[PDB]
Amino acid sequence: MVEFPEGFVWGAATSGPQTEGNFHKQHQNVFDYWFATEPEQFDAGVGPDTASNFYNDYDHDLALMAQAGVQGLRTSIQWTRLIDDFETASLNADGVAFYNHVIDSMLAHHITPYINLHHFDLPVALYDKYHGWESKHVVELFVKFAEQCFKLFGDRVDHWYTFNEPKVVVDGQYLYGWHYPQVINGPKAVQVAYNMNLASAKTVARFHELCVRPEQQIGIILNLTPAYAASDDPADLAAAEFAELWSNNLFLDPAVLGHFPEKLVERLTMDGVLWDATPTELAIIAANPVDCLGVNYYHPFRVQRPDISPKSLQPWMPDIYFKEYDMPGRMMNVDRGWEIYPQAMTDIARNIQKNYGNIPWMISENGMGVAGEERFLDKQGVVQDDYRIDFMKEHLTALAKGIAAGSNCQGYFVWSGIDCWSWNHAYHNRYGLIRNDIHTQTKTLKKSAKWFAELGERNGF
Template identity: 25%
Template sequence: MKTLTLFTTLLAVTAAKKCIVKDNKAAEGSETETVEGDLQNEIDSGVESETDAADDDELLDLSTVDYGDNVDITTVKKLPKDFKWGAATAAYQVEGAWDEGNRGESVWDHFTHEYPKNVESGDRTIDYSTNGNRACDSYHKYEEDVKMLKLMNAKYYRFSISWSRLFHDGEAKKEDGKWNVNQEGEDYYNALINTLLDNEIIPFVTLYHWDLPYALHEKYGGWLDYHSQYDFANYAEYCFETFGDRVKNWITINEPWVNCVSGYRLGPGKAPYRCTGEAPRRLANDTTGLDLEGGCSYEVGPTQYTPESEVLPANRAPQKLEDVWCSHNILLGHAQAVKVYRDKFQKEQKGLIGITIDGEAQIPWVEPGISKKEYENNKKYANLAAEFRIGWYSDPPMTGDYPASVKERMGKDLPEFTKEQKELLKGSSDFLGWNTYTAHWAAQVKNEDGSYVEPPTAEEANFDNSKKDMWDDNCKGRGDGWTCIPPTLGSQAGSSWNTKFAPTIRVGLNWFNDRYKNLIKNGIVITENGCAQPNYKVARANDEVTKKYFESIGQPQYADTYGEEDIEDESNINGTILHDKYRQDWYDQYLKNLRLAYAVDGIDVRGYMAWSLIDNFEWENGYETRFGMTYIDFYKDENLTRHPKDSLEHLGQWYLENVEQN
């Protein structure tokens, strides 16, 4: 398909998922209005001033920037009948029962309890409003979740296992043929798996979805320490041995970028709330007047990054590059677990194992009057941004090493894999799991005079300089609370980092396919995709700036504007809460692009898991942001009754119409 080839070298993702807009009115202050006004003038005039100097360059024909999705979907082949169709959740977000059944404490338990003000709450008088103590109570109500799966005709259910529910201290050991497992935890997962199979739903199991046992964080700093890879492999071995007779689809790690970058640098967005932006308040010489229930943490065990590294002291302030070392060790943990599966279980159990990374398409910035030369440069930078944001985590399991561009620009700040580790990593993912939500524009950064910011030299190569010339974001700037300044790359969904741009999924699938041709033996599975509807915290109804931007480049359909009536109204469950038109349209647009990627582009995409089956604990956003296709009133309904939204059955119908049936 000629039109899409413009975008097959592009991709990257979700800015820090900690971004919150608490007051839309505050986002409409004088500074934002001025920026929007200036941008509107540029759109109306058709050419930005910085392109005036490019008179010698041939202008880009904007009509050639086409994503090829103006197609009657019924004219292309359907997805195959063995397509893995289902929905997804994560243990900490839905299980609850945090201290029942001898479950051990996870980092999310510990840090939400110690720092509750890092989590949004609609009512802080309710003790579970800032944590997953109760969540959806799926520990007791999993059979009700299965009923919801049946409503969407789900054939698969992607859920995660709570490591600390099985091993209180995180250390899985087998002595005299018997594991030191918490039997009540094992019984729960056996019951869930068996109930799924009894309902003809296939379990798709994630071993780790961010809920590290706190005991390991306290012992050695969790993923910061090289010992973590071996503890994870031991835990994985237990799971393979115990559940592998029925589980044939395994994901080792979910979204290592979010776990490491948001947990160890961009905090306090994700546990364990490590961050380099501010000093932990509890380490201040004088804590008088400081709110010690929020902010960054200092609690951590004595840590050794590698066997050759010095041991860093316990309870220290966050160190630079913690996110980099977390990423390094978590990738090795993935590889060690895969080795165990392949050496001991895969031949007999005949299952598949892979990793899930997150990231959306990097779209080269385009505007009226842009030259072909500048657009080509933006395409180059879109690919470069993708290598940093996605390839950093997807290259090692595919090729055995980090992308060359990342190694070049990071210099000595990037750890190196040994020869043995490279061999362990290469080809360690039978399939590639991809969580995709939003897209980013990308371009080379410019100086005030319109000249390009130059890439770092070899002498400048380090973490701080690695992306100094690289811009990627889904809006043209950020205001207070990380709110986007329009135009946005698609309409503003209910999280500040999340915008609806349907070509995301197709562009990304093509990027993976081109980059890893013949390396992904069992295809790509979309392991998460979905949205929070515009809501009382985050919405941008009647967004004229975004609308006029997309009109100016000949793509009005991607502005995807909506009205006030489409914003969720928590006071009226029978309104947009249950009749979630925006979410239904989201799924329709993204799934259309997925089907086109399969049918037209020939991409080996083998599954799709909608996020999320039910409203749940949305990490630092608490219960104030709803990604679910099933409504739960967390504050007023003691029974946590499941109410299916229109999107749940809408997806069930989509499956019948777009996937080959037996």
């Protein structure tokens, strides 16, 4: 029935910090330091120090991933593992060697590399010295690190990305306490948002200057979940308008259109919390859009009025203009507390098609997490994750309507290939196609793994 374009890319996504372990890693990133000082904040006291042991198990991990039909693996290079001196971007000898092994072994196992340069993993040294992404100097050193990744690995890596979801670094580090250093400052968060867009653009710039070869392309990875209004009442549609500008156009528009959405920059100006920008910088943004887009989606987002007036005396946060809304009769993943709504896949495809030039794009993350998968092991220790196959079917179908309506969707990357470490939640929820018993680092394909191998061969289901 459901069929997909020819040459569609079927793949899996993770990150360096969530798989490698900190084995011989020279530098602490913000999560490394958080767990070393406050392990209480991590599920079951499980931190990143071993994660899914990718640093040691990479060759067989790649073999199993290919067995589960992963044609392309999207992961990330750790700034804190690759670089010795952050100011000069000198190379850590062991770190470069490791990433060569990984990339060589990806290729030997017939898996297309997709390398993301940054996944929530700021070096904590650069926060202590410069306050991290608040500093346009740190921005310059991200580029220096990106330049190094380009020279060392650009020979066999085609597909790069500047960031995975800068919004979550903004939200997490500066608004809502999710990421160490857990700063709660709205105005600071706005500058961080700007600064990360500046960095992604300057990284596209140097990428294209240091790229000769035409199949090489660099994109960015954003979550583009719409902000659905809670009703048609003007107050709610205005909350949905801002929340859309704030959660999506803040990054989508500078990344793809080359400028910030002017309704948004207007509102931040009227509020006196607009970022410090310069026309040189804004012209760098404008000159270097991304070559493609990766789209993350998991669950919808719905929005109503704020309870009190945005002009009330309170510290500035974006949240003063909208409140989350729970829709009655919603379909829920009850244990995880998320709404299920594959229709947003179709909306996202349309939005890119019409308002974003139908720029080449993929779904770079989509998947379902479940706790306690042992409950579903069969007699040969294979998780019977029928729920996981159902979820992919509903969401791939919705994706297919958008493709058919003419949306330029080139691939689909599952979260995740192998169970991996989910920040403070660590291993509470399991998303893999492949189970990891983290006590032994023994890995085993779930049932969904042979279904995904079958999906990639039929190019449909």
